[PDB]
Design a protein around this ligand. Structure first.
Ligand code: ADP
Ligand code: VO4
Ligand code: MG
Length: 706
């Protein structure tokens, strides 16, 4: 039943919008709805009415029938079903091969296949960029893109390249993923995977690049969160030989470094996951000495935390050598030299040395710091090793990169790690804004198309400039290190003096919950940051006397993790910080993505309680707004999303009317007027015919008939 004029969408203070400027709703109490033909539409740029509730309800409609993918113009939107669906089967993978976007339902498999098609067709590198906040579905979709390519390639101990490519994700997940409030399997690092293809489309090889790992997790947890998965998988006891080799109990609560918050997760079987983790290292080519060395280092990290200290000026001395000895043998170090290094670190006196002193607070920091450094270097080594076996040295030509970054998050306590994660999210959103709204309209101008630049309001340059540009939050932090008389409050005072009242995205902390020092107006919300410990987190210093012992370790792995160590430069007669390298890497990635054809996949978390099928309209609308889904749909409708080179237009559509044809542009003008179409649905460019939304599909329908 449908009444074109009285069926409207009206606002609501609890449900955002409701089905129904004065009328009463379907329930009782006191923007046009789309017809029943556009129910569960596969592409929302084809809806007659385009507004916030038209898109919200179409997504909701499809979500109710477990259709978690929907095209929204030139890109795609996905809503986390929070449950398994029979839409990722090998049978499905095969059917999607070679199909045009409109010839199959919306799917991540269709994005992957079309990215493959554009690569070989245009002779151009591609990229698949998955956005969304913590627990939206970026990693799940990243794994399905890889699955699609690996299954397609497979058509034609250690396994084949296709098997290795798939297993690289569960191998890295044990060490780099952990349970946070928002996600039981949160990626605590970003990763860009490039899948290389030869000149004719053969999957040649692959590589992975990881971006900043949350080191703090290794030695610190908040009430509602766990440390990295790996620790609990080892303690599961499904492989009891590991507990004997690592010299450990089966109780996480016996290890402070890993038992500060939660220890078991309802959705994760830690026992089955240890086997999956181990099987991946096997399939990836990891030797037993390699696997055991990695397990041994993880074990040494656990004992390292239980090491107690005491007073002997305040000087620290070991409060029991029990835990240091266990750590030292797993690491291949002499226990006495380790504790002497931690308590009395060397100072170079030219060719001699004098030891400086430490107190139990200083040694406690250095101990935590080294356990983080080892963990970070182990993760970087695992990636290097995965890349080493993934390198096939087979002929390559193009690549399809896939970006799975750590999602936007807000915790009750936000620190340095959150600012780095959320900063990347702001940057990736701005990548989308620039590509969709700035470059797109500049193409129309380049091609001599009649057009008036539209302002979509999509521009986060103010917040990005606030964080990265000189005298920004990172620049202030970078200066405040390598200034020993600088404290947490000199950094706070410098941030406020430069940005309070001067930067719109820098506000006083809103603030029961933990104490915050400043607020930041991010693209998806105001985040209250706590600046305590930022100067030390950014400088990341290490006890170089203990690092020296690590380089001389009897374990090959520990000595290789520290072989190329940037030991503090020699003094002269009179360095790269964390944030500095992170910005450098983020800009390196953004410029690299500019040299590819991007394919945006926008993930939407439907509810805060990980409930399948439950859609919370205020949370969904917040995401669709800050993502720019409506803005991104309008540029598809209001512009010309499809454009064909005059040559290609005659090579393909000459069959529609051979009477029309000997010029490239002139011939194309004759062909188009000769057909029964709206002659306003297209424009003529310098080198391409620009088509309005949908006209390409109409001509392609007519081409398939004859
Ligand atoms: N397409 C999907 N099908 C089924 N479950 C999904 C899907 N996408 C996400 N999930 C569930 O949601 C969780 C969070 O998704 P994940 O990919 O880890 O998100 P993100 O990487 O954005 O943090 C997953 O671990 C899984 O339980
Ligand atoms: O939960 V996330 O993997 O998006 O960080
Ligand atoms: Mg993830």
């Amino acid at each position: 039943p449908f009444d074109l004029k009285k069926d409207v969408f009206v606002p609501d203070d609890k449900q955002e919008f409701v089905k129904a400027v004065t009328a009463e709703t379907e329930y009782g109490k006191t923007m046009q709805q789309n017809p029943p033909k556009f129910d569960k539409i596969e592409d929302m740029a084809m809806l007659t009415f385009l507004h916030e509730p038209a898109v919200l309800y179409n997504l909701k409609d499809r979500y109710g029938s477990w259709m978690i993918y929907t095209y929204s113009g030139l890109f795609c939107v996905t809503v986390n079903p929070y449950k398994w669906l029979p839409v990722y089967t090998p049978e499905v993978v095969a059917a999607y091969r070679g199909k045009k976007r409109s010839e199959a339902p919306p799917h991540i498999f269709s994005i992957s296949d079309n990215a493959y098609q554009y690569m070989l067709t245009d002779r151009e590198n591609q990229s698949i960029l998955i956005t969304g906040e913590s627990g939206a579905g970026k990693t799940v979709n990243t794994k399905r893109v890889i699955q699609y390519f690996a299954v397609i390639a497979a058509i034609g101990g250690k396994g084949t390249l296709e098997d290795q490519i798939i297993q690289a994700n569960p191998a890295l997940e044990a060490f780099g993923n952990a349970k946070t409030v928002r996600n039981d399997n949160s990626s605590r690092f970003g990763k860009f995977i490039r899948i290389h293809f030869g000149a004719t489309g053969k999957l040649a090889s692959a590589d992975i690049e990881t971006y900043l790992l949350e080191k703090s997790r290794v030695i610190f947890q908040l009430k509602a969160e766990r440390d990295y998965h790996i620790f609990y998988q080892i303690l599961s006891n499904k492989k009891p030989e590991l507990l004997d080799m690592l010299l450990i109990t089966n109780n996480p609560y016996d290890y402070a470094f890993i038992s500060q918050g939660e220890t078991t997760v309802a959705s994760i079987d830690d026992a089955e996951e240890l086997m999956a983790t181990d099987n991946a290292f096997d399939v990836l080519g990891f030797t037993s000495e390699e696997k055991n060395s990695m397990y041994k280092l993880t074990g040494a990290i656990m004992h390292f935390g239980n090491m107690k200290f005491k007073l002997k000026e305040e000087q620290a001395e070991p409060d029991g050598t029990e835990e240091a000895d266990k750590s030292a043998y797993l690491m291949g170090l002499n226990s006495a030299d380790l504790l002497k290094g931690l308590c009395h670190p060397r100072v170079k006196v030219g060719n001699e040395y004098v030891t400086k002193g430490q107190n139990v607070q200083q040694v406690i920091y250095a101990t935590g710091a080294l356990a983080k450094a080892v963990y970070e270097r182990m993760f970087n080594w695992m990636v290097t090793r995965i890349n080493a076996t993934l390198e096939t040295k087979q002929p390559r030509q193009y690549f399809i990169g896939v970006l799975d970054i750590a999602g936007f998050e807000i915790f009750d306590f936000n620190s340095f790690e959150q600012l780095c994660i959320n900063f990347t999210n702001e940057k990736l959103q701005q990548f989308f804004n620039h590509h969709m709204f700035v470059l797109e309209q500049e193409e129309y101008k380049k091609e001599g198309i009649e057009w008036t630049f539209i302002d979509f309001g999509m521009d986060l340059q103010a917040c990005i400039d606030l964080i990265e540009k000189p005298m920004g939050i990172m620049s202030i932090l970078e200066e405040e290190c390598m200034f020993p008389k600088a404290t947490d409050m000199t950094f706070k005072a410098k941030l406020f003096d430069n940005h309070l009242g001067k930067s719109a995205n820098f506000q006083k902390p809103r603030n029961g919950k933990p104490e915050a020092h400043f607020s930041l107006i991010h693209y998806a919300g105001i985040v209250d940051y706590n600046i305590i410990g930022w100067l030390q987190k950014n400088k990341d210093p290490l006890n170089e006397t203990v690092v020296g012992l690590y380089q001389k370790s009897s374990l090959k792995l520990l000595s290789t993790l520290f072989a190329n160590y940037a030991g503090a430069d020699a003094p002269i007669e009179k360095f790269q910080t964390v944030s500095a390298l992170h910005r450098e890497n983020l800009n390196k990635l953004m410029t690299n993505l500019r040299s590819t054809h991007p394919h945006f996949v926008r993930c939407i978390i439907p509810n805060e309680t990980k409930s399948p099928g439950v859609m919370d309209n205020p949370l969904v609308m917040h995401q669709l707004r800050c993502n720019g889904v409506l803005e991104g749909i309008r540029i598809c409708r209001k512009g010309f999303p499809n454009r064909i080179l005059y040559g290609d237009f005659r090579q393909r559509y000459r069959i529609l009317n051979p009477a029309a044809i000997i010029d490239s542009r002139k011939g194309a003008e004759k062909l188009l007027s000769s057909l029964d179409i709206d002659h306003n649905q297209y424009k003529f460019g310098h080198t391409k015919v620009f088509f309005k939304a949908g006209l390409l599909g109409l001509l392609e329908e007519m081409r398939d008939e004859r």
